[PDB]
Design a protein around this ligand. Structure first.
Ligand SMILES: [N]C1=NC2=C([N][C]3[C]([N]2)O[C]([C]OP([O])([O])=OP([O])(=O)O[C][C]2O[C](N4[C]=NC5=C4N=[C]N=C5[N])[C]([O])[C]2[O])C([S])=C3[S])C(=O)[N]1
Ligand SMILES: [N]C1=NC2=C([N][C]3[C]([N]2)O[C]([C]OP([O])([O])=OP([O])(=O)O[C][C]2O[C](N4[C]=NC5=C4N=[C]N=C5[N])[C]([O])[C]2[O])C([S])=C3[S])C(=O)[N]1
Ligand SMILES: [N]C1=NC2=C([N][C]3[C]([N]2)O[C]([C]OP([O])([O])=OP([O])(=O)O[C][C]2O[C](N4[C]=NC5=C4N=[C]N=C5[N])[C]([O])[C]2[O])C([S])=C3[S])C(=O)[N]1
Ligand SMILES: [Cu+]
Ligand SMILES: [Cu+]
Ligand SMILES: [Cu+]
Lengths: 161, 161, 161
């Protein structure tokens, strides 16, 4: 397997219910894959979809960190202002050490693209030796957020080990 | 009434005690009114003044969100470094979901005007279907902070419903 | 003594164990000293070194704030992504009122120098009449972070009193 095991969690009532396809997930996988060397040897080894439900999100983040030994978990979606956007709240429950600089850079860079970046309520942090980062559900958002992080993400992953 | 009901809370021992007038409140009302269309049909329907006392601030934020059905609450003042600046702490107690991007944009834009922007400890978030945003007490601060938010605030208010 | 009493806490297993010298501490003292007038009459009156241990860090921050009457505490180190970087978590336990604008400015300015700035998980806030700010352990980081804060830090210290 890879130096760094990456897992992608799509958070969406719509996708989970079979009411639409996942358009964000494949874009996240593509951005990680195409940056695999810049990330120190990272590969997406697993993806999943969960509804906008705090307990479901928490359970998968805990399993991936504590049991499956993932190194990086990117979540996609559920970061906005609607009542069903609960990804950050689930994430804050599971992380042990917050990583606000990652959120700073994602916001700073995203705002250059659209003022609507300010509506992302993303959280990020470390649980054990797993880095967890919330990204927006807009399929174009993951690429933009990953570009923002890529300069330092390899060093983040080295450090957490 | 309006599409979006806005309420303005001035937080000030001085104003509450009758030791001076409210100079921030009218500026906040004026900025919201003059941006009413850009905000999706917002109107300030209520204002109040409370002292720099956590329980008083909490009680009004809870009443306006839970009983009076406000959609946007702007607080003015009590965000700085003095011992009596307790607005963010009261706010953090009442909000359910934090909205850090709003704080990011207010800080980013405010710092272009003055380095003293860094002394605002403002919080922001959502309780039910009410968005609550702390702004500094300086009468010129609300206009600057609202300009920073205006590009996306209509979409924020639509989403929270 | 000075108008503002500053104390510097180096957080490092290596320095604490006698496995290397403190290179960050002297740089912090030098930057504060050389900015003493810009800070309103600040002087470093005390330094100490502790290991990367939450209880040790907490205990010194509490003693310096509650007993020794320090006005500004800068901590150096332990803000990164490694398992032993626990300074922010200790700091968050002791502070009463968070000061996110200080973190915003440090991050904003640090990112102009290096993308690795995003790996600092620094916290900051007020306990009583003591301002506590986490800075990175890189000896060059304190100078950069202090430059970012210097425009408003005098006013912060005046306010907290
Ligand atoms: N960079 C960037 N950033 C950002 C953006 N956008 C914006 C922001 N930021 O964010 C926010 C928030 O969001 P959220 O919540 O996360 O998202 P959601 O709701 O989840 O989502 C949205 C949309 O998108 C879509 N999706 C999602 N997911 C998905 C999808 N599709 C397909 N598939 C999947 N999976 C939908 O349609 C929805 O609606 C905000 S609000 C904003 S605007 C950008 O862009 N960038
Ligand atoms: N944008 C902007 N931002 C900012 C500013 N300024 C600065 C900052 N930011 O903030 C901070 C904080 O503050 P706070 O605390 O909130 O405020 P206070 O204390 O409350 O206040 C201040 C002043 O002002 C005035 N006022 C207030 N309120 C009021 C008033 N007047 C009238 N009426 C009313 N209501 C007074 O005098 C006081 O003293 C800081 S510190 C800073 S400097 C800007 O500008 N912008
Ligand atoms: N401005 C700026 N910022 C920043 C930098 N760098 C980077 C960031 N930011 O931060 C982060 C984090 O870090 P921390 O964790 O805090 O650090 P530590 O680990 O503790 O440290 C590092 C290094 O350095 C050194 N040191 C420390 N401390 C000390 C030292 N030396 C001598 N003495 C003393 N005391 C060591 O070697 C270690 O390793 C990150 S990661 C980054 S890269 C800058 O630069 N700036
Ligand atoms: Cu949106
Ligand atoms: Cu001020
Ligand atoms: Cu580093």
């Amino acid at each position: 397997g890879p130096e760094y095991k990456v897992a992608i969690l799509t958070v969406s009532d719509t996708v989970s219910a079979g009411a639409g396809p996942d358009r964000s997930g494949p874009r996240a996988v593509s951005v990680v894959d195409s940056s695999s060397e810049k990330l120190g040897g990272a590969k997406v080894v697993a993806t999943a979809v969960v509804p906008d439900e705090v307990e479901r999100i928490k359970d998968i983040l805990q399993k991936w960190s504590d049991v499956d030994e993932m190194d990086l978990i990117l979540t996609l979606g559920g970061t906005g202002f609607t009542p069903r956007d609960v990804t950050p709240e689930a994430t804050k429950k599971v992380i042990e050490r917050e990583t606000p600089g990652l959120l700073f850079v994602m916001m700073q860079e995203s705002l250059k693209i659209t003022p609507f970046a300010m509506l992302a309520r993303s959280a990020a942090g470390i649980r054990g030796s797993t880095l967890i980062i919330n990204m927006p559900g807009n399929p174009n958002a993951v690429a933009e957020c990953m570009e923002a992080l890529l300069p330092a993400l390899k060093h983040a992953l080295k450090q957490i080990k």
